Write a protein that binds this ligand. Structure first.
Ligand code: SF4
Ligand code: SF4
Ligand code: SF4
Ligand code: SF4
Ligand code: SF4
Ligand code: SF4
Ligand code: SF4
Ligand code: SF4
Ligand code: SF4
Ligand code: SF4
Ligand code: SF4
Ligand code: SF4
Lengths: 321, 65, 79, 84
């Protein structure tokens, strides 16, 4: 036949690298399996229907080795890079020759997500709460490390601008930012910031509901795979406090849920979870392709048991009317 | 001597990052409460009358003597 | 809809893969049970997967994490 | 015929200059890249720039590049003709 369209799919360590060789031109869709979260916002969005979703719970827990969260048919992929633009936690990158290069953005053919992050440095106080509560590793705080946990950044007494008496006003030593390509808009850091100095807006809007009475108990896969740790197992009450109400088995915090979909993709139940997104927030104008992608992302979905065998090896959800 | 006001403390580490006496333990963050909540522990074996951390706290949550 | 494989040679019949599977736990432990089919049942001392056509598993890893002497391999790739 | 006076395809190449999809070229036996909208080589007789619909993602950049010529119809379907 002909050989040179060499399609290869190599698992180089923790990165699954999907490639298309030519003589001098390559195409590398690189998935970083340590950051994927098992949402399907990469399978719903694929214009060419190549990305499928795999064993989300097992992979996200470390019990699966011969697979990633997602499988991409690199013979069908077209290397548009729509998946790279529309993945909320950037765990997919496109490298054309050897450099991260997105032609569709270079030509402005696709809008991007407006995570809209910012930290008014005239209000932040170098607190440590925002780095501590961040579910993902996306707060880059650049502060000199004082006697707490290390040798003095300047000195305990120079952490406060003191004339040696009284403090002179304000101290604010250093600078704190939010790696805008890693924030998932969970809002743990805005809701819990002491001085209200963080401005993040959720990319998706909608509602998610948990029918606790249908969780079969010891299945905290949803809890394990939620990126924004919105889900919790409601703590059992002590005795002399139960008051005839026994307990719930699972619940969610709508303040922190980012409407990703990993919970739905991971739950082995039937319809415990109901997910429906209503509005994605973007910058960049629009496209007919983007209207199609909105229509694809905005269909309600829920779990399913006993999907069809012909597609064994992937996930299929329920279409809710 | 030392006394925090848990009424007006946000558990910001900027009080336990300075002195080696103040160790601020944030017990694990759970969406149950959806808030930050921990404790400030002060040991005599390391203090001084420095009082820097009184005004280093963003809030006025710390009075020392 | 994944595929689970049980190494019959080192299965002891402990039944902690049957008790811990959240699809098995659907029948008796759910309000208004949806589906009453079961992946594993320990017949003759070893765990047998009744889910022959790979339709009910969800790659949860509760069963791989449960078996005390690792013996359940979970395949996340299409069979 | 369809009513666009300004014309159809003149083979300028702006469409393939802006297309982001890259696929192997069957004319070059796969050794060379070509966009989703393409010609095999520069000496093709109808210089009309086919669109490869199996690989197009309908991003719509090609139509913006084509502009007033309006040669690109991304919704075209297989037409059937009977000839004696
Ligand atoms: S969209 Fe979700 S599943 Fe797809 S690559 Fe991004 S994080 Fe992973
Ligand atoms: S690059 Fe485009 S075609 Fe390829 S997997 Fe991503 S979205 Fe699908
Ligand atoms: S939580 Fe707010 S005040 Fe504290 S470091 Fe972060 S941005 Fe600054
Ligand atoms: S919104 Fe969430 S992920 Fe983004 S910086 Fe804040 S805590 Fe981190
Ligand atoms: S609770 Fe929200 S963020 Fe967490 S998995 Fe479910 S949809 Fe995603
Ligand atoms: S919602 Fe899904 S993952 Fe969570 S306990 Fe129920 S079945 Fe298990
Ligand atoms: S004393 Fe001040 S800085 Fe320290 S934890 Fe309390 S509020 Fe935060
Ligand atoms: S008074 Fe000074 S020495 Fe004592 S705990 Fe506060 S900062 Fe540390
Ligand atoms: S992976 Fe989960 S659903 Fe599948 S057999 Fe194991 S416990 Fe059951
Ligand atoms: S848990 Fe392991 S040892 Fe026990 S029955 Fe299942 S496969 Fe066999
Ligand atoms: S389709 Fe339009 S842009 Fe492309 S070569 Fe023809 S006239 Fe030029
Ligand atoms: S619509 Fe198709 S041919 Fe035109 S730029 Fe987009 S991918 Fe290329």
């Amino acid at each position: 036949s002909t050989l040179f369209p060499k399609y290869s799919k190599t698992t180089d360590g923790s990165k699954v690298i999907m490639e298309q060789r030519l003589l001098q031109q390559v195409n590398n869709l690189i998935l970083d399996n340590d950051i994927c979260t098992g949402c399907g916002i990469c399978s719903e969005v694929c214009p060419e229907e190549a990305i499928s979703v795999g064993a989300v719970g097992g992979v996200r827990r470390g019990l699966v080795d011969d697979a990633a969260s997602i499988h991409v048919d690199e013979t069908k992929c077209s290397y548009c890079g729509v998946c790279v633009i529309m993945c909320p936690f950037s765990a997919l990158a496109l490298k054309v020759d050897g450099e991260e290069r997105l032609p569709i953005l270079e030509k402005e053919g696709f809008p991007t997500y407006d995570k809209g992050t910012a930290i008014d440095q005239d209000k932040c106080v170098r607190c440590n709460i925002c780095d501590d509560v961040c579910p993902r590793d996306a707060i880059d705080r650049d502060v000199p490390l004082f006697e707490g946990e290390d040798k003095e950044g300047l000195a305990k007494g120079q952490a406060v601008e003191l004339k040696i008496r009284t403090v002179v006003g304000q101290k604010k030593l250093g600078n704190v930012n939010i790696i805008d390509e890693d924030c998932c808009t969970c809002r743990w850091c805005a809701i819990n910031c002491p001085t209200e100095a963080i401005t993040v807006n959720k990319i998706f809007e909608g509602e998610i509901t948990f029918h606790a009475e249908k969780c079969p108990g010891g299945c905290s896969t949803c809890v394990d795979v939620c990126p924004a740790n919105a889900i919790y197992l409601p703590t059992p009450k002590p005795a002399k406090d139960m008051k005839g109400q026994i307990e719930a088995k699972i619940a969610v915090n709508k303040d922190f849920c980012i409407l990703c979909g990993a919970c739905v993709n991971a739950c082995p139940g039937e319809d415990i979870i109901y997910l429906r997104r209503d509005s994605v927030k973007i910058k960049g104008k629009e496209t007919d392709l983007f209207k199609k992608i909105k229509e694809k992302l905005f269909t309600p979905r829920t779990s399913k048991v006993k999907e069809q065998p012909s597609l064994a090896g992937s996930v299929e959800l329920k279409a809710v009317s | 001597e030392f006394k925090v006001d848990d009424e007006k403390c946000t558990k910001c580490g900027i009080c336990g990052n300075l002195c080696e006496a103040i160790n601020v333990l944030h017990k694990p963050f759970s969406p149950e409460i959806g808030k930050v909540e921990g404790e400030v522990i002060w040991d005599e074996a390391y203090c001084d009358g420095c009082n820097v951390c009184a005004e280093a706290c963003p809030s006025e949550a710390i009075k020392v003597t | 809809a994944f595929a689970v494989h049980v190494n019959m040679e080192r299965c002891t019949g402990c039944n902690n893969c049957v008790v811990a599977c959240p699809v098995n736990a659907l029948e008796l432990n759910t309000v208004n049970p949806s589906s009453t089919d079961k992946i594993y049942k320990v017949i003759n001392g070893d765990a047998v997967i009744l889910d022959v056509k790979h339709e009910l598993c969800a790659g949860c890893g509760i069963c791989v994490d449960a078996c005390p002497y690792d013996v359940i391999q979970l395949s996340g790739q299409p069979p | 015929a369809k009513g666009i006076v300004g014309g159809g395809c003149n083979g300028c190449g702006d469409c393939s200059a802006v297309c982001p999809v890259i696929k192997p070229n069957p004319f070059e036996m796969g050794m060379a890249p070509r966009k989703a909208i393409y010609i095999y080589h520069a000496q093709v007789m109808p210089l009309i720039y086919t669109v490869d619909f199996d690989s197009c993602v309908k991003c719509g950049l090609c139509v913006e590049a084509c502009g007033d010529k309006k040669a690109i119809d991304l919704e075209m379907q297989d037409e059937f003709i009977t000839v004696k």
